[PDB]
Design a protein around this nucleic acid. Structure first.
Ligand SMILES: [Zn+2]
Lengths: 122, 61, 325, 313
RNA sequence: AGACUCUGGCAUGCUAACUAGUUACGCGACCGGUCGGCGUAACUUCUUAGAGGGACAAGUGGCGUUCAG
């Protein structure tokens, strides 16, 4: 059958990683921009690269890939990562606690905690 | 009695040398009687056969 | 009439029943079954894709974390819930539906959680599965808008609001009998039945508890007052030193530990179906075992295979000549 | 005021990239395509079909990216990816002159009401001035564009003869004849540019591209005026000669704007099939407004020209 | 090994060809036509020999851990 070359793949990844903005879904446009971006000797090789780019973008615009880093999804990812809510999830009104746990707390000087609700195992 | 046939599905290749085709036969007698038969030669899905004996049933199990 | 993914999945042809047929565009694209997608490709098109306002989505989630279902829910699940709420607000009066649910009533019994009540075939002292009973087997069956939700986590939030919902059947659903899991360390409930570690404290400590939700909006839980359940039997046992590599099967202790991939070959994990139309021609009555591939010699097994073997306590006695894979 | 499909035009194998409508004849309309063929259509507007092809202008060795008509409906001009700029005769259906100078893909072609003023815009990073006979007037190199020259149009106005050139370098550059001097730089875009269209009055220009935001600039002032947001990428931009209407070809659909109130007029899309859910709908590459003021000519990736007519009510 | 290069298939697009050919136009021969008869204005269809294109699994559908294929 037919299988993609390592060289073709790596170059494609480079081209997507750097210049995602220039590329699209039109194969020919992607080919031409590739030709105007990278130092490619062979036509066939260039074509292959373009194809790989095209496939990649068909795939990538649906959802993010495992391999490369996009210059928009880096920002987006960062935004999603450095997120914090308004109210902390540990700052809770009433926390449910075991009798044993309560006992332990008492044996640590913290018998004067207010937020605890000692629920019995029914 | 001579009964005409249909081809519902082409299953695989039987025979020693891979010469016989195992084929699902629907009847053209309106009945949904699906008997699996062996054919010699090229058969595609949508062929119509002329079976000499309809009572026969080819290698099932 | 807001359709969930379960409606298409169970092939509920209730396109004749409702007129307000609306769904999310996401839930119909998430289905991986070919027959349901084939059904989507044919059905009389009166359905209309709708996405709700973020004001309503914020309002659903506001009390979804109060009822204790929000972790069990999905993103798409909230979307359907919000769709119903904003559709009810559009046509009918919004004042019908309550904000903030009710305090749950605790009612304990001495029955074991594994008792086969509410299983249709099983019968105590006549309860028969008949060729008439098959379409009747649904749940607990009793005007303009509703839902087609088969998921209980969905149904719970819907009925807490007071949104009149239904199932694959024509008439409205009143009482919702199902099981939920409660962790006996942190007491945080999940409606997701599949999971084995809790979302909160991560231990393998989730235990089955039966719940009922009325159309009124009241919840009650039946806790097991049975010492067999909360018994510290086969729990402390010495564990092997953690091995890495390709073949090492670790004892499985957290929900998110990285296992080395050990899959079964396609020759192996093919089950024989006898109801195939072309089955009779195939030489042998059963699909051949795999014995040639590496997965067989490494003794890679399916998750369902070896189930009760896990339930036995490790500090016990296996037969003198067996090793437990 | 509504927009409705009057008919559909079939005749191209490759994508319809540019449509050129003539003011002189409201009965014959020219359409460029990727199948290396530019078809002159004879309109019949029957229930069977809206128009039958009359002549197919074969000659180019690559995609015909831009076609343009003349002041009179007797001359055509095309710019194809092979670096060839070809002057066509619509009467004979044969080439008259061949304009050779570019090394790369000739993207866009410009033509005046004066007629003896031809400007080609190529990926060669170069603007070239041409005579009707084939003489190169002036080669532009001194700070033309950092990247590909996307689209080039003139100003159909009795005032200053101004050329507008947008590029892939994120800039809109304004040039003036006889001096060939950079008049106005227009900075305010995210992503590459695709199309430029000048007002029929000769006062405003509209530029768009990747961002999906049609940026409106003034010709006389050199000033920002409007920003018109859209869903997807902009392929083509269009003006109405009578209605003061900015029609922009978006992703799969077309979006019509009224600039007087910044209001949407109508969205234009026809697709019923839900079976191809994981497949992307055919994009609309070309867009041209007819001389009538009611008829729209839209070229798609589906290699199919669709026509839109105005039904009042 | 693959990749690299060539080669072949394709161009009524381009570059040319007094050792390639066609068309038209003159003269002649023959019965308004036939002529591998002869003489320069048409430039490449045929012929040649080069450049540049052109195919990349490009697109659609199905199958696929929904990815590799
Ligand atoms: Zn817990």
């Amino acid at each position: 059958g037919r299988v993609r070359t390592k060289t073709v793949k790596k170059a494609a990844r480079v081209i997507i990683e750097k210049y995602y903005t220039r590329l699209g879904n039109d194969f020919h446009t992607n080919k031409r921009v590739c030709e105007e971006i990278a130092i490619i000797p062979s036509k066939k090789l260039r074509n292959k690269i373009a194809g790989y780019v095209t496939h990649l973008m068909k795939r990538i615009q649906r959802g993010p890939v495992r391999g490369i880093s996009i210059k928009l999804q880096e920002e987006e990812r960062e935004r999603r990562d450095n997120y914090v809510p308004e109210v902390s999830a540990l700052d809770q009104e009433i926390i449910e606690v075991d009798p044993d746990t309560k006992e332990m707390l008492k044996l640590l000087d913290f018998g004067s905690l207010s937020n605890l609700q000692v629920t019995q195992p029914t | 009695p001579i009964k005409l046939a249909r081809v519902t599905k082409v299953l695989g290749r039987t025979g020693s040398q891979g010469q016989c085709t195992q084929v699902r036969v629907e009847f053209m007698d309106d009945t949904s009687r699906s008997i699996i038969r062996n054919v010699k030669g090229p058969v595609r899905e949508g062929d119509v056969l002329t079976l000499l004996e309809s009572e026969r049933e080819a290698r099932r199990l | 009439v807001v359709a969930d993914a379960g409606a298409f999945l169970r092939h509920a042809a209730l396109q004749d029943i409702g007129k307000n047929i609306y769904t999310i565009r996401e839930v119909v694209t998430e289905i991986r079954d070919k027959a349901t997608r084939r059904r989507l490709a044919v059905l009389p098109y009166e359905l209309r894709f709708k996405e709700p306002l973020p004001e309503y989505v914020r309002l659903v989630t506001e009390f979804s974390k109060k009822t204790g279902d929000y972790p069990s829910l999905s993103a798409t699940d909230i979307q359907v819930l919000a769709l119903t709420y904003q559709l009810e607000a559009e046509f009918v009066g919004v004042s019908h539906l309550k904000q903030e649910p009710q305090k749950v009533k605790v009612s304990s019994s001495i029955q074991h959680p594994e008792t086969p009540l509410h299983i249709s075939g099983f019968h105590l002292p006549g309860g028969w599965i008949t060729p008439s009973n098959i379409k009747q087997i649904q749940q607990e069956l009793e005007v303009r808008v509703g839902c087609l939700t088969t998921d209980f986590a969905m149904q719970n939030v819907l009925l807490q609001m007071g949104l009149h919902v239904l199932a694959v059947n024509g008439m409205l659903i009143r009482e919702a009998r199902s099981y939920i899991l409660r962790c006996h360390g942190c007491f945080k409930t999940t409606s997701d039945m599949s999971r084995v570690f809790c979302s909160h404290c991560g231990n393998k400590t989730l235990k089955k508890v039966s719940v009922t939700v009325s159309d009124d909006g009241t919840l009650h839980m039946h806790f097991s007052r049975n010492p067999k359940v909360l018994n510290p039997r086969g729990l402390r046992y010495s564990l092997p030193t953690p091995k890495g590599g390709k073949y090492a099967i670790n004892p499985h202790l957290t929900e998110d530990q990285r296992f080395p991939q050990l899959r079964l070959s396609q020759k192996a994990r093919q089950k024989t179906n006898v109801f195939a139309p072309d089955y009779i021609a195939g030489v042998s009555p059963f699909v051949e075992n795999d014995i040639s591939s590496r997965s067989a010699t490494l003794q890679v097994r399916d998750s369902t295979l070896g189930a009760g073997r896990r339930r036995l306590n490790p500090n016990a006695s296996r037969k003198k000549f067996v090793k437990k894979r | 005021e509504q927009m409705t499909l009057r008919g559909t035009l079939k005749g191209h194998n490759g994508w319809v990239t540019q449509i050129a409508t003539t003011p002189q004849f409201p009965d014959m309309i020219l359409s460029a395509s990727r199948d290396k063929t530019i078809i002159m259509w004879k309109l019949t507007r029957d229930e069977t079909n809206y128009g039958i092809p009359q002549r197919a202008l074969r000659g180019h060795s690559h995609f015909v990216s831009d076609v343009v008509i003349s002041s009179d409906g007797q001359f055509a001009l095309s710019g194809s990816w092979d670096g060839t700029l070809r002057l066509w005769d619509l009467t004979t259906g044969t080439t008259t002159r061949r304009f050779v100078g570019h090394t790369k893909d000739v993207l866009s072609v410009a033509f005046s009401s004066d007629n003896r003023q031809i400007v080609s815009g190529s990926r060669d990073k170069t603007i070239k001035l041409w005579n009707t006979l084939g003489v190169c007037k002036y080669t532009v190199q001194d700070e033309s564009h950092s990247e590909w020259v996307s689209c080039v149009r003139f100003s159909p106005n009795s005032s200053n003869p101004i050329i507008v050139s947008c590029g892939w370098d994120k800039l809109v550059k304004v040039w003036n004849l006889a001096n060939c001097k950079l008049k106005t730089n227009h900075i305010g875009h995210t992503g590459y540019l695709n199309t430029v269209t000048v007002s029929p009055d000769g006062s405003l220009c509209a530029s768009g591209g990747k961002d999906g935001q049609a940026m409106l600039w003034d010709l006389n002032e050199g000033k920002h005026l409007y920003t018109l947001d859209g869903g997807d990428i902009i392929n083509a931009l269009c003006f109405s000669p009578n209605r003061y209407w900015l029609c922009a070809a978006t992703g799969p659909s077309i979006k019509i704007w009224d600039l007087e109130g910044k209001i949407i007029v109508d969205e234009l899309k026809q697709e019923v099939i839900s079976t191809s859910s994981k497949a992307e709908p055919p994009q609309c590459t070309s867009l041209a407004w007819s001389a009538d003021g009611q008829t729209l000519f839209a070229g798609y990736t589906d290699n199919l020209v669709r026509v839109w007519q105005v039904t009042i009510g």
